Write a protein that binds this ligand. Structure first.
Ligand SMILES: Nc1ncnc2c1ncn2[C@@H]1O[C@H](COP(=O)(O)OP(=O)(O)OC[C@H]2O[C@@H](O)[C@H](O)[C@@H]2O)[C@@H](O)[C@H]1O
Ligand SMILES: Nc1ncnc2c1ncn2[C@@H]1O[C@H](COP(=O)(O)OP(=O)(O)OC[C@H]2O[C@@H](O)[C@H](O)[C@@H]2O)[C@@H](O)[C@H]1O
Ligand SMILES: [Zn+2]
Ligand SMILES: [Zn+2]
Ligand SMILES: [Zn+2]
Ligand SMILES: [Zn+2]
Lengths: 374, 374
């Protein structure tokens, strides 16, 4: 029907920092070589999208944001082989080009073609496929999922099982994989181990599920909001601790409770102080602490390097350490085989045109995850 | 001859902080159960011994310091099985009790019976075996090797090959193993990789040798003293860089030279700023930076956690990550089989009674390592 033609559809456009998203009629050019055009079925609202709004995550404006989605391939440009029209897909904010020294490395996943480091707001060829009233609109992280239709480079899209439910599995595009991979791929949580998870929003819940899939014996959820504990326990936390209940510092409580420190700690709040507390509460000799997110305007933290010298390991990663194009389809296969449950993460579902309401829910802390549906 | 009796010999005693060592006549009690008395053959002067002098490394005084040595077993207390009189040995400042949760762990080596964390200056049973004119003298790290004879717990001593030359292999007790293990056990340097080593004193040379044994392709030595480069190249550095030669920051030079950052960086200066530079110069996606020493009075460092979020790993360790009682005898076997060379590390050899001269050489930077011989 619409292959090789411009498509007019609606998108949420951010014209300037600190303003609401405007629903606009936009033109979406046909995909050029190695590009795929996708019809969006559902998209998650993530913190990172809010950082674009606030000017924290610097990216050229005006922009169509959104990076956590699923959809259906509408058409493919010249020389696309990995996907076909009608295939279900997940766009990847971390590409997997397969060629660079990161993609060749057994451990790396932060592909050198990413648009995160020095953002240009373009496709890989350096132009945009979006216009609004003749004016070009930037892409975001080579995904731009706040549009009924989007164009993405083939290196940034993963084919998933034909029978997948898209309203759930869009979370595999960011929040779930980030948390789950942090435990299963970055930390390599072992059977029988003790884990502590600082922050019980969506990504901390996903870390907990990863710790549980890896066979942790004890998983201690830490959060200053007691309302988060009920869901943390439902997905696998064996205990929950609220640092405001104590007279002593939380790392001293966690070191007492785990008889000398936890095997794996995970920082998923994004706060400087809690990064350092998380490192300290892991066992001095062989503890691993993983930093799951960092706000993109963070200052320096302050840390005594003696924490590392006994044998601790501090690490970070993007997208849970997963090589994106390889892993996403296998995570979706595991969901289809019922190995984990995404529904506890989904607290609100809104139609796309209520995007600004979605962001309010995110800003206020009522939501674990809001999904927008098209 | 002297088994089961007190032995009168000479030791170097530190009576107060910031004063020279006094050579004193001391009494060395016979070993009680699971203790070994050793006749010292040679002992290294290490930085850590100077930190005791300066009051940086807090330990009870008066004390017999020294922890890097080799010697010959003079007698064994009740229930010692791992060693016999006449066996060549290396005392271990990191014990290996075999029982605790660290010794049971495949990765840990900082045994919970160490005397480094909360120092008591005693044997494991809580008393001393040294007196000077009726006054008790503390032990240091359960070793105290600045004495013609010392008593150490069996968990702190390793039996080595009978044919070993003790004047060389005493370095296996601290400096060499720390550097070499940092590359071979903590970083797990891989074949073909690029490594950067900040600091080309004794331990940095040992890191270089570890990188070379592991098959690194390029090993970049970094040091502000150009006189260190000649030996760094002799043991395996492929290139040497002096940061004072440049107008730009060293991590930017190292990132240019290695086409996007090194695989493994090692900080072996002990300085805060250079810890952070070392982390930054490793590849963002899969780089590993290892902190080899920390001065025991270090302040906090200041660091942007964004360095970790792309995929870098920061780690530290004591004694090169090696389980001490298992590893020392195999390192000595490798020396005996000619797999590495300790002689480039040994720049000065002094008789024990010139200990204060040894420390001057260490304080001035003339020495790579001074060995004291008895
Ligand atoms: N000092 C604190 N100690 C413990 N918990 C805290 C503290 N301050 C805030 N929190 C809790 O941290 C949690 C933050 O959760 P969300 O804001 O829902 O965030 P989520 O989508 O999970 O991710 C937050 C962001 O931080 C990054 O580490 C992570 O990758 C993500 O980008 C909340 O449950 C909040 O109560
Ligand atoms: N800013 C700098 N940049 C690079 N090199 C430096 C700098 N400042 C000092 N150095 C160099 O660092 C080296 C320190 O070497 P030594 O003092 O001989 O120390 P060594 O016995 O090898 O160990 C020093 C201590 O630091 C710890 O990391 C290590 O484990 C040991 O405890 C010297 O070669 C010195 O020139
Ligand atoms: Zn790549
Ligand atoms: Zn996200
Ligand atoms: Zn032990
Ligand atoms: Zn030492």
């Amino acid at each position: 029907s619409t292959a090789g033609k411009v498509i007019k559809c609606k998108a949420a456009v951010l014209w300037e920092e600190k303003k609401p998203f405007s629903i606009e009629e936009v033109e979406v050019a046909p995909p050029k070589a190695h590009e795929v055009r996708i019809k969006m079925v559902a998209t998650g609202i993530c913190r990172s999208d809010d950082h674009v709004v606030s000017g924290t995550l610097v990216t050229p404006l005006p922009v169509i944001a959104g990076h956590e989605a699923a959809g259906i391939v509408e058409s493919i440009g010249e020389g696309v082989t990995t996907v076909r029209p009608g295939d279900k897909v997940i766009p990847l904010f971390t590409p997997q080009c397969g060629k660079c020294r990161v993609c060749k490395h057994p451990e790396g996943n932060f592909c050198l073609k990413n648009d995160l480091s020095m953002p240009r707001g373009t496709m890989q060829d350096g132009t945009s496929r979006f216009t609004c009233r003749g004016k070009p609109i930037h892409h975001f992280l080579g995904t731009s999922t706040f549009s009924q239709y989007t164009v993405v480079d083939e290196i940034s899209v993963a084919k998933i099982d034909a029978a997948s439910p898209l309203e759930k599995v869009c979370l595999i595009g960011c929040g779930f994989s980030t948390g789950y991979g942090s435990a299963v791929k970055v930390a390599k949580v072992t059977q029988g181990s003790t884990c502590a998870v600082f922050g019980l929003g969506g990504v901390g819940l996903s870390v907990i599920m990863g710790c549980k899939a890896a066979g942790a014996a004890r998983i201690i959820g830490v959060d200053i909001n007691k309302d988060k504990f009920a869901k943390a326990k439902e997905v696998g936390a064996t205990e929950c601790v609220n640092p405001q209940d104590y007279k002593k510092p939380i790392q001293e409580v966690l070191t007492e409770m785990s008889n000398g420190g936890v095997d794996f700690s995970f920082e998923v709040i994004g706060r400087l102080d809690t990064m350092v507390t998380a490192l300290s509460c892991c066992q001095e000799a062989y503890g691993v602490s993983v930093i799951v997110g960092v706000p993109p305007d963070s200052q320096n933290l302050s840390m005594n390097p003696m924490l590392l010298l006994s044998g601790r390991t501090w690490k970070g990663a993007i997208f849970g350490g997963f090589k994106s194009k390889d892993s996403v389809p296998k995570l979706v296969a595991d969901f289809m085989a019922k190995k984990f449950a995404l529904d506890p993460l989904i607290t609100h579902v809104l139609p796309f045109e209520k995007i600004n309401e979605g962001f309010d829910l995110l800003r206020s802390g009522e939501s674990i995850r809001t999904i927008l549906t098209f």
